[PDB]
Amino acid sequence: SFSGYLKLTDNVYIKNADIVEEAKKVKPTVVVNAANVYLKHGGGVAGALNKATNNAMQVESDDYIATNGPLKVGGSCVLSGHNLAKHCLHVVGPNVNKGEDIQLLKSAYENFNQHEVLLAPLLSAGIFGADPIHSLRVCVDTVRTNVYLAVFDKNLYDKLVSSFL
Ligand SMILES: Cc1ccncc1CO
């Protein structure tokens, strides 16, 4: 199971870890991807998870988009977890670097409530441009299921834990 996590609340846990290495170790039922509406996994967490699947995540995602069209910002879809997890929950948080509504971050986290346990990154953090402290607050105040957050950056992990209210 998940090991080395710091408990923040009844259901939210956090660890300074690479989510790809964490997924390969745990093989969780659900790994969350920090997706965009087109499921184009170029960089950030998405680029890293896709590279770990040898691009199989991108091939599956292109077929999904060809059939269904783009996701909504704040929305999600369940696809295969490939070699990382049973499933990948592709969740689109708002990208503030694309001028998207930060208010959609709560809607994005609501997708996590459809899964009893998830391994996830902080939505809209990193290259999505939102304040990770704000993302963690929205996570704890929105997600009711068991979420194990992997924060890649050690300095950011320390700042998140030390400032957690
Ligand atoms: C977690 C992560 C995010 C972006 N790039 C690389 C990594 C490591 O796999």
From Swiss-Prot:
Domain Macro: 1-165
Membrane topology reported for the UniProt record: Multi-pass membrane protein
Activity regulation, free text: Inhibited in vitro by GRL-0617.
Compartment(s) of residence: Host endoplasmic reticulum membrane
Coiled coil stretches, renumbered: none
Record note on what altering residue 29 to A does: In strain: Mu/B.1.621
Reactions it catalyzes: Thiol-dependent hydrolysis of ester, thioester, amide, peptide and isopeptide bonds formed by the C-terminal Gly of ubiquitin (a 76-residue protein attached to proteins as an intracellular targeting signal)
Domain of life: Viruses
Oligomer status and interactors: May form homohexamers. Interacts with N protein.
Biological role: Responsible for the cleavages located at the N-terminus of the replicase polyprotein. Participates together with nsp4 in the assembly of virally-induced cytoplasmic double-membrane vesicles necessary for viral replication. Antagonizes innate immune induction of type I interferon by blocking the phosphorylation, dimerization and subsequent nuclear translocation of host IRF3. Also prevents host NF-kappa-B signaling. In addition, PL-PRO possesses a deubiquitinating/deISGylating activity and processes both 'Lys-48'- and 'Lys-63'-linked polyubiquitin chains from cellular substrates.
Name the record gives this protein: Papain-like protease nsp3
Organism lineage string: Viruses, Riboviria, Orthornavirae, Pisuviricota, Pisoniviricetes
Residue span relative to the full protein: 1027 to 1191 of 7096
